[PDB]
């Protein structure tokens, strides 16, 4: 089990021996931003338990040049000797430190190494980033990104979340630079040559993936919380203005989270720094949180209502991690959702609490719908499943871990109620502070929520029974893949309930469907309301089938009130008809989230072949009266979806009819829109949606409006200004001339708004010229004018639209090698590049090609779950078209007639 020039490597597991156990690291790093590298060294106070000949820990791409043990309890290693022999098994990113004489139980020793390496050159470990100044200058910073397994690319350690420890960090630097790390700075000291050296307050107990340090020359804005925590928003100097909103919201939000969890944030300061080159959206390192400029920065003149909602959200996400993830940490990456689902969920609670005007409560169903898409394919996974290779650990970062997790926690809250939930949370956070937990601990804590507690009455047995229930439930949502379908049959006053595993591109008669129905069973906290009583009823379906006896007995029944539950409902008989009828005469007699869920569920059942397209399309008629935007837009998103799908083949008869129905219907609401930023958030959102829809449908009035604004813009040389909500429409419209497009690219290079840049680069990719599009990709790869962290989204933008899906696929296939040199296999970048270029395919031809490309990609050694997922998805598409394309042709053709 062995290499690196001979000799046995003592340990043979991917995991680390749990014999050694570190407690404290003294970490000294000295990076040079001219030579672009670092020398550095460390001192790890370990505590041996079992006695041992060897000590094992992680390292990767670090050159180790000195190694010593040293102890204060075990005399044989009294100061300062002795030297250790260094054994390096790379294929498990491990090293072995060879001790001269077996170590002694219950004695603390001290492992010391000097190591060096070059500054990294992509998104992980300790890497180089650059930024442009308003002057046109290029500057360099050096930043860490360790999650999940790249701490070890920076300093050797016990690089698994369970080994928490205290960290002590010194950084040496010039004086053009400052130096940030997790904790605040205790001491700066002047050195002989002239260099400075920073000393940071030893951290609390914490995991390696959270360790951080930066050497830049940024500016900040600071402020203090209630509890007297110092918050600072760092950014490169010319963008300090754009840090205001982040300061405001982070403040309100840390205030909130302290209250809600009833735990103070422990560190004295909290920094939020906007890194120019940054792969994920943000990384939540304790006290030093990193962000993509677009996750943090904000500027009234160019970023939009939606942008503000995004920034709020990400800031809400990262702070929640400080408790959910940083304070309490998952025991191992199998339960990453413990961190990531709670943080996603706590987005909703906190932003609603602190910023209800952002109206973010309405938006959160999208979070849940989005997962159902993948969770309804066979290739899905359970929320919590095993993982080992770093590439698998990187794969756990996906809608299941995030959205689905958040979603069932939203289910569970509706069950137990806010006050109970909050209690259970607060307990979990307290009982596990400064250490770790696993799936089961959360349930136990959340189930055993709070007389009874804590110092023998009736209904006190119901509590410990109801508790065991609540735990028994959630176990099934975390270890079972997919989402359940609840079928409801109305029979006078008898409602019968069937439970099924919702599949898609798989029909109830199809040969495969019945094997895929396996042992799947859920405890589904059902809810419902009736046309006769808006009073909400609740019942736990713990089995394959069951029956409820309705009082009054009335027109329709509505299961999943407001969609708080992770299930889809079907209506056999006349339910779907009753409901669409009710939807058509007094839709107001149906709750808005019930509407948003019906429109969702309806179209999702055409997917399963448990309804035909013409029912769905016949529901959308009521949209002309529909006034709640969440519902108007969900509906509108389906027809728009269709159109784009048609357009992607030549299906011009269907597309042109879709276009016509879209402009004809909805013409009233399309026409009330201002080319302004006025109104609510959902008001502003609705505006951009329609105006975009219109401008994509060549509705020549709105193309003229846009092309005017663009012109006024380009002639005034930036002086004349375009409202944010309309900014992307206008830019894309202008981008059709080689003149506008030329101007736009040039304006991209000079902009200081990361959000304007975003909007421009979208506009640039709505060019019809093959030549244009390709250049973008090239520039993207090169990574000087357009940062490579934007490559994936870019390809996806391009591939998305007719003139580009070919070019995209072509490029990805022909460049797989180069792409990998830029991103981990591995990365969300590669995942999004693969599926963004293939998953919209809907032809047997394209499916053929994709199956090959992935086939190829296995041996050479490359396996990613996303391969099968894509396949299943293109399949669903083919099967969708063939099983409903004619119905769409017909429904539309029927519509041109009456009336
Ligand atoms: C461009 O990345 C995105 O926009 C992300 C990526 C992602 C997409 C789908 C998904 O299911 C999970 C993650 N999408 C999200 O919904 C998201 C929004 C805000 C965040 N702060 C985050 N990330 C976090 O809190 C961190 N734990 C990130 C891991 C750090 N990575 C690293 N060290 N290599 C994610
Ligand atoms: C990084 O290395 C550079 C060498 O390129 C150091 O800069 C030199 O510093 C010495 C004394 O501080 C000067 O006499 C040289 O003239 C400098 N060279 C240049 C090109 O400016 C720099 O100090 C190092 N920084 C760190 C943090 O180690
Ligand atoms: C390592 O971290 C812990 C915190 O995780 C440090 O502090 C102890 O933490 C508890 C828990 O909050 C506090 O109540 C104690 O007051 C802390 N100890 C003391 C002595 O005050 C611990 O001190 C850290 N170790 C080092 C060497 O700094
Ligand atoms: C040493 O660790 C083993 C497991 O690795 C454990 O079973 C044993 O109890 C420990 N030794 C002693 C003497 O306790
Ligand atoms: C920020 O913008 C305001 C005008 O809105 C201006 O007065 C101020 O000087 C700007 N600050 C920086 C650092 O650009
Ligand atoms: C949003 O906040 C309001 C009060 O601000 C509260 O009544 C409501 O329950 C919250 N919604 C959610 C989904 O938490
Ligand atoms: C569905 O998934 C299971 C396990 O993930 C697998 O064994 C089976 O082959 C899959 N079914 C199809 C049709 O691919
Ligand atoms: C039905 O719709 C009408 C539309 O004018 C509305 O006035 C009425 O309030 C609705 N029904 C009920 C019971 O409120
Ligand atoms: C289909 O569209 C392509 C371009 O996408 C065009 O060149 C071709 O002529 C069209 N074919 C038919 C039969 O309409
Ligand atoms: Zn997160």
mmCIF file of N, CA and C in Angstrom, residues 377 379 834-835 838-839 841 843 846-855 864-879:
data_model
loop_
_atom_site.group_PDB
_atom_site.id
_atom_site.type_symbol
_atom_site.label_atom_id
_atom_site.label_comp_id
_atom_site.label_asym_id
_atom_site.label_seq_id
_atom_site.Cartn_x
_atom_site.Cartn_y
_atom_site.Cartn_z
ATOM 1 N N UNK A 377 -35.879 12.234 -10.678
ATOM 2 C CA UNK A 377 -35.240 11.309 -11.575
ATOM 3 C C UNK A 377 -34.667 10.177 -10.752
ATOM 4 N N UNK A 379 -31.695 8.954 -10.902
ATOM 5 C CA UNK A 379 -30.309 9.275 -10.569
ATOM 6 C C UNK A 379 -30.155 10.172 -9.340
ATOM 7 N N UNK A 834 -20.604 20.879 -17.793
ATOM 8 C CA UNK A 834 -21.147 19.682 -18.429
ATOM 9 C C UNK A 834 -22.654 19.755 -18.676
ATOM 10 N N UNK A 835 -23.426 20.049 -17.634
ATOM 11 C CA UNK A 835 -24.870 19.946 -17.759
ATOM 12 C C UNK A 835 -25.441 21.177 -18.462
ATOM 13 N N UNK A 838 -25.400 20.353 -22.131
ATOM 14 C CA UNK A 838 -26.059 19.163 -22.643
ATOM 15 C C UNK A 838 -27.511 18.906 -22.185
ATOM 16 N N UNK A 839 -27.863 19.310 -20.977
ATOM 17 C CA UNK A 839 -29.131 18.881 -20.423
ATOM 18 C C UNK A 839 -30.375 19.510 -21.068
ATOM 19 N N UNK A 841 -30.797 19.400 -24.449
ATOM 20 C CA UNK A 841 -30.950 18.479 -25.543
ATOM 21 C C UNK A 841 -32.231 17.656 -25.390
ATOM 22 N N UNK A 843 -33.312 15.521 -28.299
ATOM 23 C CA UNK A 843 -33.329 14.629 -29.440
ATOM 24 C C UNK A 843 -32.578 13.335 -29.165
ATOM 25 N N UNK A 846 -28.851 13.747 -30.159
ATOM 26 C CA UNK A 846 -27.992 14.424 -29.193
ATOM 27 C C UNK A 846 -27.701 13.527 -28.021
ATOM 28 N N UNK A 847 -28.709 12.758 -27.625
ATOM 29 C CA UNK A 847 -28.549 11.778 -26.557
ATOM 30 C C UNK A 847 -27.433 10.802 -26.903
ATOM 31 N N UNK A 848 -27.449 10.347 -28.155
ATOM 32 C CA UNK A 848 -26.425 9.475 -28.719
ATOM 33 C C UNK A 848 -25.058 10.071 -28.433
ATOM 34 N N UNK A 849 -24.827 11.268 -28.977
ATOM 35 C CA UNK A 849 -23.557 11.982 -28.824
ATOM 36 C C UNK A 849 -23.130 12.135 -27.379
ATOM 37 N N UNK A 850 -24.080 12.422 -26.480
ATOM 38 C CA UNK A 850 -23.707 12.702 -25.086
ATOM 39 C C UNK A 850 -23.262 11.418 -24.374
ATOM 40 N N UNK A 851 -23.987 10.323 -24.627
ATOM 41 C CA UNK A 851 -23.668 8.996 -24.079
ATOM 42 C C UNK A 851 -22.239 8.607 -24.429
ATOM 43 N N UNK A 852 -21.842 8.925 -25.654
ATOM 44 C CA UNK A 852 -20.492 8.659 -26.108
ATOM 45 C C UNK A 852 -19.478 9.468 -25.346
ATOM 46 N N UNK A 853 -19.662 10.790 -25.349
ATOM 47 C CA UNK A 853 -18.742 11.712 -24.673
ATOM 48 C C UNK A 853 -18.486 11.355 -23.203
ATOM 49 N N UNK A 854 -19.523 10.953 -22.480
ATOM 50 C CA UNK A 854 -19.336 10.550 -21.093
ATOM 51 C C UNK A 854 -18.608 9.219 -21.017
ATOM 52 N N UNK A 855 -18.993 8.319 -21.924
ATOM 53 C CA UNK A 855 -18.410 6.980 -22.009
ATOM 54 C C UNK A 855 -16.913 7.119 -22.106
ATOM 55 N N UNK A 864 -18.408 11.070 -12.581
ATOM 56 C CA UNK A 864 -19.259 12.041 -11.902
ATOM 57 C C UNK A 864 -20.729 11.673 -12.033
ATOM 58 N N UNK A 865 -21.439 11.630 -10.911
ATOM 59 C CA UNK A 865 -22.884 11.410 -10.895
ATOM 60 C C UNK A 865 -23.654 12.256 -11.920
ATOM 61 N N UNK A 866 -23.113 13.414 -12.252
ATOM 62 C CA UNK A 866 -23.792 14.331 -13.139
ATOM 63 C C UNK A 866 -23.939 13.724 -14.535
ATOM 64 N N UNK A 867 -23.123 12.720 -14.837
ATOM 65 C CA UNK A 867 -23.178 12.063 -16.142
ATOM 66 C C UNK A 867 -24.542 11.399 -16.382
ATOM 67 N N UNK A 868 -24.962 10.599 -15.408
ATOM 68 C CA UNK A 868 -26.180 9.821 -15.546
ATOM 69 C C UNK A 868 -27.380 10.752 -15.495
ATOM 70 N N UNK A 869 -27.328 11.689 -14.558
ATOM 71 C CA UNK A 869 -28.328 12.738 -14.377
ATOM 72 C C UNK A 869 -28.674 13.471 -15.663
ATOM 73 N N UNK A 870 -27.643 13.893 -16.359
ATOM 74 C CA UNK A 870 -27.802 14.521 -17.642
ATOM 75 C C UNK A 870 -28.523 13.602 -18.608
ATOM 76 N N UNK A 871 -27.995 12.382 -18.727
ATOM 77 C CA UNK A 871 -28.604 11.332 -19.558
ATOM 78 C C UNK A 871 -30.086 11.185 -19.268
ATOM 79 N N UNK A 872 -30.433 10.810 -18.040
ATOM 80 C CA UNK A 872 -31.845 10.780 -17.620
ATOM 81 C C UNK A 872 -32.646 12.023 -18.013
ATOM 82 N N UNK A 873 -31.998 13.176 -17.983
ATOM 83 C CA UNK A 873 -32.680 14.439 -18.215
ATOM 84 C C UNK A 873 -32.965 14.631 -19.709
ATOM 85 N N UNK A 874 -31.984 14.331 -20.555
ATOM 86 C CA UNK A 874 -32.214 14.433 -21.982
ATOM 87 C C UNK A 874 -33.277 13.427 -22.406
ATOM 88 N N UNK A 875 -33.227 12.246 -21.800
ATOM 89 C CA UNK A 875 -34.270 11.246 -21.973
ATOM 90 C C UNK A 875 -35.665 11.772 -21.625
ATOM 91 N N UNK A 876 -35.828 12.301 -20.418
ATOM 92 C CA UNK A 876 -37.094 12.907 -19.996
ATOM 93 C C UNK A 876 -37.607 13.871 -21.050
ATOM 94 N N UNK A 877 -36.673 14.585 -21.668
ATOM 95 C CA UNK A 877 -37.002 15.579 -22.676
ATOM 96 C C UNK A 877 -37.542 14.978 -23.941
ATOM 97 N N UNK A 878 -36.832 13.969 -24.438
ATOM 98 C CA UNK A 878 -37.277 13.215 -25.596
ATOM 99 C C UNK A 878 -38.650 12.644 -25.293
ATOM 100 N N UNK A 879 -38.750 11.864 -24.223
ATOM 101 C CA UNK A 879 -40.036 11.292 -23.863
ATOM 102 C C UNK A 879 -41.108 12.360 -23.678
#
